[PDB]
C-alpha cells in the first residue's frame, strides 16, 4: 500500500499547505490600491524602427549600458544594434537557423543563443582578430532550448524543453547544477536582481523558484489555466509576473506564497508572448498574439495604454536598465523603440 | 552627412556594408527548397533519407535545385511549441508504412499503429500553420505489403472494408483513406507515391511535386488564381 499511501500523504500535505496559505489572504491587492491615483493614459511614439532581419524575430535582449541590442531571427542571424543611430554593430551568422532565444552578457563581452539544436552557443564579441567567434558550445540538454540568462561572464542558466533547467560553467563547458521538478516543457526564465534566485515558468501551468547556489526548488506557484510563455521579476525582486496562453497575466508574491492581481480583459482572447515591467514597477507591458502590446497599471489592474504598430505577433519585448525605452520585436521582422 | 563625426561616418558605412552582406545572404537562402520530413515511429523515413541531437538537416541537389530536408524526429517535446518555426516550408514529406495495417502499437497493444499514423496525418494536415503547404505522401514497404496481405486481411485495420483482398485494390483503399483526411481540398494538395525501390524514382517524384508546388505558388502570388 506504499503507492496509494504516499499518494494520499502528498494529497493531504498539499491540502494543508493550501489551507495554511488561504488563511493568510487578509485582503485583495485591489482592496488596498482602491484609492491610489491612476496612472492615466500612457501614449508612446515609435522613435526608431530597426530593419534588416529577413524572417521572424524570436528573441531580443538589452545591453546593461541601455544602448545596445541583440536580436535573433530565423534567417540564421544574430544582429547587434546601436538603437540610438540604428546602426548595426555586428551581424553574427549562426550554425543552426532554428534559434529560439538569445542573451546579452551583463559585462558586454559575450552573447549567447540557442534553439532547436539543443545547444547553447556562446560568442566572444571583443576578440583581437576583429571578428565574433564561437567561444563555447554547451551541450547536454535533450530538448530544444527555450531560454538562457547570463549570471556573469562565466555562468549561464538555461531552460530547455526536456522539463529541466541547467546552470553551466562556461570555462569548463559542463553543467554544474541541474534543476528538476517540472512536469512539462520549461518556457521562460527570469533572474532575480541579485541573481541569488531565479524563477521558471513551464508548460504545466506552473512556476517555480530555484536557489542557484543550492540547486533545489524553494516554492511553486500555480493559478494559470494554460501554458506559461513569459515571466519577469518585479524590480525589487519580491514579486514576479507571468503570462500564459489563457490571455491572463498574474502577479505572484514570493513572501506571501500567493498571487496578488490578475491582468485580463474580456476583449482579449489570445495568449501572451512576452512580459516586462517598468523601471519603477508601476507599468506592466505585455506582448500579445493580438499583434499589439498592452501597458497595464500594475497596481490597479486596468489597461493604461496600447502599443500598436506591428503587422504580426509580438514575440519579444524589453525595457532598458535606465528605463527610458521599450524595444518590441515581432514576426514581421521589425523592431521598434518606444518612448 | 554633416552633423556626423568622422568615426560616426565610418560606423555608418560599416553598417551599410553589413546590410549589403545581409541582403546577399538572404537572397541566396530564398532559392533553397525547404522540406519538412515528418512521419511516425518506424515509418520508414530512414530509407527515404538514404535515397536522397535535435533537428537533423540534409542538403542535396537535383537538377540545379537545392533541397533542405529537416528531420525533426529526435525531439520528444510538445509539437505545438515549436511547429510554427516551420511555417513557410515548401512542402511536408509524410512517410507511411503500408505494412502496419496488422501491427499493434508498441506501448499499447490495443491501439493500432496505422490509426496512430492517420491521427498524426490528420493533426498536421489540418493545422493552422500548414493551411497552404502541400504534403508529399510516401507509402513505403509496398513489397512487404503484397506479401503479408496473402495471409492477413486488411479488415483487421479497417473493419468497414468491403472489397477484394488484393494488393492493387487495398493499396488504393489506403491511399484514399489517407487523402480523405484533408479538409481544405481546394487550398492545399496531397501527392502520393508508392515507393519501395528503383534508380531515381523517389528523388524525381519529389522534384516533380516541388516544381508543381512552386508553379502554383507563383501563380497565386503573381495575380492569377
Amino acid at each position, epitope marked *: 500500500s506504499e503507492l496509494d499511501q504516499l499518494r494520499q500523504e502528498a494529497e493531504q500535505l498539499k491540502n494543508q499547505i493550501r489551507d495554511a496559505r488561504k488563511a493568510c489572504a487578509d485582503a485583495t491587492l485591489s482592496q488596498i490600491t482602491n484609492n491610489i491615483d491612476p496612472v492615466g493614459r500612457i501614449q508612446m511614439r515609435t522613435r526608431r524602427t530597426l530593419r534588416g532581419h529577413l524572417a521572424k524575430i524570436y528573441a531580443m535582449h538589452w545591453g546593461t549600458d541601455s*544602448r*545596445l541590442l541583440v536580436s535573433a531571427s530565423q534567417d540564421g542571424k544574430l544582429i547587434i544594434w*546601436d538603437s540610438y543611430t540604428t*546602426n548595426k*554593430v*555586428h551581424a553574427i551568422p549562426l550554425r543552426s537557423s532554428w534559434v529560439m532565444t538569445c542573451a546579452y552578457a551583463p559585462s558586454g563581452n559575450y552573447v549567447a543563443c540557442g534553439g532547436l539544436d539543443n545547444i547553447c552557443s556562446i560568442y566572444n564579441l*571583443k576578440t*583581437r*582578430e*576583429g*571578428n565574433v567567434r564561437v567561444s563555447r558550445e554547451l551541450a547536454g540538454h535533450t530538448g530544444y532550448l527555450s531560454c538562457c540568462r547570463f549570471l556573469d561572464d562565466n555562468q549561464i542558466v538555461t531552460s530547455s524543453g526536456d522539463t529541466t533547467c541547467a546552470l553551466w560553467d562556461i570555462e569548463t563547458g559542463q553543467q554544474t547544477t541541474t534543476f528538476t521538478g517540472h512536469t512539462g516543457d520549461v518556457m521562460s526564465l527570469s533572474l532575480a536582481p541579485d541573481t541569488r534566485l531565479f524563477v521558471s515558468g513551464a508548460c504545466d501551468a506552473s512556476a517555480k523558484l530555484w536557489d542557484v547556489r543550492e540547486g533545489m526548488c524553494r516554492q511553486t506557484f500555480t493559478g494559470h489555466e494554460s501554458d506559461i510563455n513569459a515571466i519577469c521579476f518585479f524590480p525589487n525582486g519580491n514579486a514576479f509576473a507571468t503570462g500564459s496562453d489563457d490571455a491572463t497575466c498574474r502577479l505572484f508574491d514570493l513572501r506571501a506564497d500567493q498571487e496578488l492581481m490578475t491582468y485580463s480583459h474580456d476583449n482579449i482572447i489570445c495568449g501572451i508572448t512576452s512580459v516586462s515591467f517598468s523601471k519603477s514597477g508601476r507599468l506592466l507591458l505585455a506582448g500579445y498574439d493580438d499583434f499589439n502590446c498592452n501597458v497595464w497599471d500594475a497596481l490597479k489592474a486596468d489597461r493604461a495604454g496600447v502599443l500598436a504598430g506591428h503587422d504580426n505577433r509580438v514575440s519579444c519585448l524589453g525595457v532598458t536598465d535606465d528605463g527610458m525605452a521599450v524595444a518590441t520585436g515581432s514576426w514581421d521582422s521589425f523592431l521598434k523603440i518606444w518612448n | 552627412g554633416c*552633423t556626423l*563625426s*568622422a*568615426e*560616426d*561616418k*565610418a*560606423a555608418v*558605412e*560599416r553598417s551599410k*556594408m553589413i546590410d549589403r552582406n545581409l541582403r546577399e545572404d538572404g537572397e541566396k537562402a530564398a532559392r533553397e527548397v525547404k522540406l519538412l520530413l515528418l512521419g511516425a515511429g518506424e515509418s520508414g523515413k530512414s530509407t527515404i533519407v538514404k535515397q536522397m541531437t535535435g533537428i537533423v538537416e540534409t542538403h542535396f541537389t537535383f537538377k540545379d535545385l537545392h533541397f533542405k530536408m529537416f528531420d525533426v524526429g529526435g525531439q520528444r517535446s510538445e509539437r505545438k511549441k515549436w511547429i510554427h518555426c516551420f511555417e513557410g516550408v515548401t512542402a511536408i514529406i509524410f512517410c507511411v508504412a503500408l505494412s502496419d495495417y496488422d501491427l499493434v502499437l508498441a506501448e499499447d497493444e490495443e491501439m493500432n499503429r496505422m490509426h496512430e499514423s492517420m491521427k498524426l496525418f490528420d493533426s498536421i494536415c489540418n493545422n493552422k500553420w500548414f493551411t497552404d503547404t502541400s504534403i508529399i505522401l510516401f507509402l513505403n514497404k509496398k513489397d512487404l505489403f503484397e506479401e503479408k496481405i496473402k495471409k492477413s486481411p486488411l479488415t483487421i485495420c479497417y473493419p468497414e472494408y468491403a472489397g477484394s483482398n488484393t494488393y492493387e485494390e487495398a493499396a488504393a483503399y489506403i491511399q484514399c483513406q489517407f487523402e480523405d483526411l484533408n479538409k481544405r481540398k481546394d487550398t492545399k494538395e496531397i501527392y502520393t507515391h508508392f515507393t519501395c525501390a528503383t534508380d531515381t524514382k523517389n528523388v524525381q517524384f519529389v522534384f516533380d511535386a516541388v516544381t508543381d508546388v512552386i508553379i502554383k505558388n507563383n501563380l497565386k502570388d503573381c495575380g492569377l488564381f
Partner: single-chain antibody
Amino acid sequence: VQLVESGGGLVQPGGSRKLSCSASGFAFSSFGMHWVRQAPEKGLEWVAYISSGSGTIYYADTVKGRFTISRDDPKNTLFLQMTSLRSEDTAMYYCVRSIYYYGSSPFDFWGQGTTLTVSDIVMTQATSSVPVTPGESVSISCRSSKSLLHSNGNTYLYWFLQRPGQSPQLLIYRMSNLASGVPDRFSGSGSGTAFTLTISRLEAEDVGVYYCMQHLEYPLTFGAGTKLEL
C-alpha cells in the same frame, strides 16, 4: 596579429616607389587602414586612409595627387603607390589598422615600419621633455586649437607612446578609455580643449615619447611629442 611592411631603401629624387604591408592574424577585410609616416628626427604625421570596403579614401593635403592607397583583400595586403618623391618624404612609414563601430579602439595595432630615404586643428604639447625619476607621478598636457568634444558627448583624443626603437602603442582612446593591454597606471583626463595624461608609478618601461592626436576630422593631426627620459 601581425603587419609587416616592405618597400623602403634609398630612392633617387623625383622617381617613384611602392610600399606593401602584409597582414596576418586578423580579419583584414573588416579593418580600415592608415599610412602614418615619421621624419627621422620629428614626430608622427598622418598620410593616408582607406576604409573597410575601399569606399572611402583620404590623403593629407601634402601628398594628395602624388600618393595612392589601395588594398588587396583576398591577398591581405595594403599598397601605397608614391609618385614624384621629393626630398622631404624621407621617413619611416607605418601602417596602422582601424575598426570603427560603437565602442571600438581605432588605432590599437601599429605596423613595424618601412625606412625610406630620398637622396586644420593644431595640437600643441608645450613641454618637449620631462626630467623625472621613477616612483613619482608624471603629468603631460596637450592643448587643442578647437574643442574636440563633439555634440554627441565624444571627445576624440588619442594618446600614443613610442619607446626607443619600437612602434607607437595606443595608450588611451577618446581621452578617458584605457586601451586593452595597458596597465592602470596611465590615466587620461581633461575637458573640451585642454587635456592631461597622468602616470601614478613610473617604471623603466615607460620612458619614451608621448603623442596626442585628434580624430575629430581629417587630416588627423599629431602632437609634437613629450619625451620622458630617465
